[PDB]
Design an enzyme around this catalytic site. Structure first.
Site, PDB file in Angstrom:
ATOM      1  CG  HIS A   1      23.256   0.179   6.310  1.00 13.42           C
ATOM      2  ND1 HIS A   1      23.464   0.269   4.918  1.00 13.42           N
ATOM      3  CD2 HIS A   1      22.181   1.028   6.595  1.00 13.42           C
ATOM      4  CE1 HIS A   1      22.446   1.039   4.391  1.00 13.42           C
ATOM      5  NE2 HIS A   1      21.695   1.483   5.373  1.00 13.42           N
TER       6      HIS A   1
ATOM      7  CD  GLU B   1      24.991   3.226   5.359  1.00 14.08           C
ATOM      8  OE1 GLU B   1      23.874   3.795   5.304  1.00 14.08           O
ATOM      9  OE2 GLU B   1      25.602   2.919   4.324  1.00 14.08           O
TER      10      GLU B   1
ATOM     11  CG  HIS C   1      17.187  -0.131   5.314  1.00 19.21           C
ATOM     12  ND1 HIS C   1      16.414   0.923   5.095  1.00 19.21           N
ATOM     13  CD2 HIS C   1      18.492   0.364   5.257  1.00 19.21           C
ATOM     14  CE1 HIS C   1      17.079   2.004   4.880  1.00 19.21           C
ATOM     15  NE2 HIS C   1      18.393   1.729   5.089  1.00 19.21           N
TER      16      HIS C   1
ATOM     17  CG  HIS D   1      19.472   3.939   8.066  1.00 21.00           C
ATOM     18  ND1 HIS D   1      20.361   3.801   7.031  1.00 21.00           N
ATOM     19  CD2 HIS D   1      20.204   4.415   9.119  1.00 21.00           C
ATOM     20  CE1 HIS D   1      21.493   4.352   7.336  1.00 21.00           C
ATOM     21  NE2 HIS D   1      21.485   4.624   8.661  1.00 21.00           N
TER      22      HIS D   1
ATOM     23  CB  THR E   1      23.765   5.764   2.696  1.00 22.17           C
ATOM     24  OG1 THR E   1      22.987   4.580   2.983  1.00 22.17           O
ATOM     25  CG2 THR E   1      23.591   6.861   3.786  1.00 22.17           C
ATOM     26  CB  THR E   2      21.696   2.741  -1.467  1.00 18.16           C
ATOM     27  OG1 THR E   2      20.338   3.222  -1.404  1.00 18.16           O
ATOM     28  CG2 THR E   2      22.074   2.048  -0.174  1.00 18.16           C
TER      29      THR E   2
ATOM     30  CG  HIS F   1      21.032  -3.533  -4.036  1.00 19.27           C
ATOM     31  ND1 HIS F   1      22.304  -3.595  -4.525  1.00 19.27           N
ATOM     32  CD2 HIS F   1      20.204  -3.464  -5.143  1.00 19.27           C
ATOM     33  CE1 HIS F   1      22.248  -3.577  -5.887  1.00 19.27           C
ATOM     34  NE2 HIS F   1      20.980  -3.547  -6.246  1.00 19.27           N
TER      35      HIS F   1
HETATM   36  N1  5EF Z   1      20.398   4.065   3.911  1.00 25.22           N
HETATM   37  S1  5EF Z   1      19.075   4.720   3.067  1.00 25.22           S
HETATM   38  O1  5EF Z   1      18.049   5.015   4.112  1.00 25.22           O
HETATM   39  O2  5EF Z   1      19.431   5.896   2.217  1.00 25.22           O
HETATM   40  C1  5EF Z   1      18.492   3.428   1.985  1.00 25.22           C
HETATM   41  C2  5EF Z   1      19.109   2.257   1.748  1.00 25.22           C
HETATM   42  F1  5EF Z   1      20.208   1.783   2.435  1.00 25.22           F
HETATM   43  C3  5EF Z   1      18.583   1.274   0.929  1.00 25.22           C
HETATM   44  F2  5EF Z   1      19.219   0.087   0.814  1.00 25.22           F
HETATM   45  C4  5EF Z   1      17.403   1.525   0.229  1.00 25.22           C
HETATM   46  S2  5EF Z   1      16.859   0.259  -0.972  1.00 25.22           S
HETATM   47  O3  5EF Z   1      15.551   0.677  -1.690  1.00 25.22           O
HETATM   48  O4  5EF Z   1      16.446  -0.940  -0.111  1.00 25.22           O
HETATM   49  C5  5EF Z   1      18.157  -0.136  -2.169  1.00 25.22           C
HETATM   50  C6  5EF Z   1      17.934   0.540  -3.481  1.00 25.22           C
HETATM   51  O5  5EF Z   1      17.352  -0.485  -4.251  1.00 25.22           O
HETATM   52  C7  5EF Z   1      16.782   2.740   0.392  1.00 25.22           C
HETATM   53  N2  5EF Z   1      15.595   3.046  -0.383  1.00 25.22           N
HETATM   54  C8  5EF Z   1      15.669   4.271  -1.226  1.00 25.22           C
HETATM   55  C9  5EF Z   1      15.779   3.964  -2.742  1.00 25.22           C
HETATM   56  C10 5EF Z   1      15.031   5.134  -3.416  1.00 25.22           C
HETATM   57  C11 5EF Z   1      13.946   5.357  -2.395  1.00 25.22           C
HETATM   58  C12 5EF Z   1      12.704   5.984  -2.620  1.00 25.22           C
HETATM   59  C13 5EF Z   1      11.799   6.094  -1.563  1.00 25.22           C
HETATM   60  C14 5EF Z   1      12.165   5.591  -0.269  1.00 25.22           C
HETATM   61  C15 5EF Z   1      13.426   4.968  -0.084  1.00 25.22           C
HETATM   62  C16 5EF Z   1      14.311   4.879  -1.155  1.00 25.22           C
HETATM   63  C17 5EF Z   1      17.293   3.684   1.269  1.00 25.22           C
HETATM   64  F3  5EF Z   1      16.698   4.857   1.446  1.00 25.22           F
HETATM   65 ZN    ZN Z   2      20.161   2.824   5.224  1.00 27.15          ZN
END
Ligand code: 5EF
Ligand code: ZN
Ligand code: 5EF
Ligand code: ZN
Lengths: 261, 260
Positions: free
Chosen positions: A91, A102, A89, A115, A196-197, A64
């Site tokens: 986007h 975003e 990561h 981010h 945002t996911t 993702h």
């Molecule tokens: N744009 S964002 O910053 O909101 C954002 C994301 F864009 C994204 F892709 C992920 S993920 O874990 O790689 C995808 C879900 O599998 C996370 N990770 C999230 C999933 C749940 C979690 C728990 C602890 C820390 C980060 C995250 C995320 F916080």
């Molecule tokens: Zn993000």
């Protein structure tokens, strides 16, 4: 198996992840009617962002996103608790439409968005625990525009052809993550929102720096062509493109700014 | 039951209404990268738009928008089939953020937006039956900005206080609906999309006029403050504000323009 395109795309997330249809959702459009200057938004300090070049950090494609793991000794000071880094990561859009940030600004998308995810390590022992708790996460967002080649971002992008498929992992030597931040970090937008996911937890304190950074057309084209959502052996490959969420209703929120003009 | 705010808002429409998560969703941002001139797009003719001032047309508040019923002799000519009018309605924001059009232009919202819905009457007996069918609907959209007082829009807006709550209805004497359309109606964007409210069927040929109209600041504030979503006796009333859908992803697609 949520996605950003087709039957399992964003308008369907809330079928399996109820918070995605709840309040306080991100991203949003940053526009004047909802901005309010707040003089109590003092400068963040970025501590242990200068990761040692002799150490290495795990880069993973999870299908993702592509994320770089960050060490918990990396933190932001300035918030009402310490928040420690857990991962960064990006986007982005696609080769024929390089407009995949975003957050937008007065209705316009930037080329991409970085981010850097942190969690309140004063209160919680790991980011997953923090992610269900009030103000448990703080994410820094950097807007990325098409411009000059950026050697610091390239410290990440040079490794993408090695995490091309879901589940693949590579190691990235440490570098100074502050190099990925823009000019005048004291100028930012601040607001309460969400992941945002999926699962879209409404637990994030957002800081979006006011000024964008640049990366080149070729770096965006690499980023947009290198990666797949699917495993190496999947007979129905999907490119990892246009991985951003549309902006969300404000639900009466304001966005606070550290800059008055 | 669906709303524009809270747990029942747009991101949860697709639970009950699956097309809201499917293809060809509207509204979209109209921006230069996706625009293509199409010389085939000639001017529409608006026939039967001058409504008898001796007839009355029903204005209702349905809890989602304020709609005026239109007669089936009112129609667009210029499309492959005749499309007959069924109703018009508006979308708007709120006085703290008064930018509630559905379509945007180079990422910018207009103050509000007027939609005149039509159905393929050559192929189907009524708009309800057409709405989930191939080629079933056509909607005209007029962008609205704040400027000069608009007498013609006031022909509708002067009745708003009689349809304040859900389920209320008023009568509007016929007037010339073409007075609500902007200058140079030959200039427009066209694309294939969907209803912007449940059930979001992907059955709409959209025509969005290039030029906006004006209404006064007092008229826009009236529209934004005159209506509620709830019944008169609801202990928890809800203002009808921000009744527009967020723009949808639109990728590997063009919007055709009748102008270069
Ligand atoms: N744009 S964002 O910053 O909101 C954002 C994301 F864009 C994204 F892709 C992920 S993920 O874990 O790689 C995808 C879900 O599998 C996370 N990770 C999230 C999933 C749940 C979690 C728990 C602890 C820390 C980060 C995250 C995320 F916080
Ligand atoms: Zn993000
Ligand atoms: N922005 S829009 O032009 O897509 C649009 C609306 F914005 C809107 F509010 C309505 S509604 O009837 O008032 C409320 C139920 O959808 C309709 N009515 C549609 C819903 C299905 C249907 C069936 C017959 C006649 C009209 C409509 C609509 F087409
Ligand atoms: Zn409408």
């Amino acid at each position: 198996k949520w996605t950003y395109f087709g039957p399992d795309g964003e308008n369907s997330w809330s079928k399996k992840y109820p918070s995605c249809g709840g309040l306080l959702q991100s991203p949003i459009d940053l526009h004047s009617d909802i901005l309010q200057y707040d003089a109590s938004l003092t400068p963040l300090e970025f501590q242990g962002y200068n990761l040692s070049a002799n150490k290495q950090f795990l880069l993973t494609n999870n299908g993702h996103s592509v994320k770089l793991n960050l060490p918990s000794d990396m933190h932001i000071q300035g918030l009402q608790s310490r928040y420690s880094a857990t991962q960064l990561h990006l986007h982005w859009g696609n080769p024929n439409d390089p407009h995949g940030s975003e957050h937008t600004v007065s209705g316009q998308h930037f080329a991409a968005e970085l981010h850097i995810v942190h969690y309140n390590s004063d209160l919680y022992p790991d980011a997953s625990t923090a992610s269900n708790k009030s103000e448990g996460l703080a994410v820094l967002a950097v807007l990325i525009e098409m411009g000059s080649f950026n050697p610091s971002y390239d410290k990440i992008f040079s490794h993408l052809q090695h995490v091309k498929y879901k589940g693949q992992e590579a190691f990235v030597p440490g570098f100074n993550i502050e190099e990925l931040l823009p000019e005048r970090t004291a100028e930012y937008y601040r607001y309460r929102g969400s992941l945002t996911t999926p699962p879209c937890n409404p637990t994030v304190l957002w800081t979006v720096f006011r000024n964008p950074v640049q990366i080149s057309q070729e770096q965006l084209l690499a980023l947009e062509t290198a990666l797949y959502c699917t495993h190496m052996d999947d007979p129905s490959p999907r490119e990892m493109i246009n991985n951003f969420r549309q902006v969300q209703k404000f639900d009466e929120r304001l966005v606070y700014t550290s800059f008055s003009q």
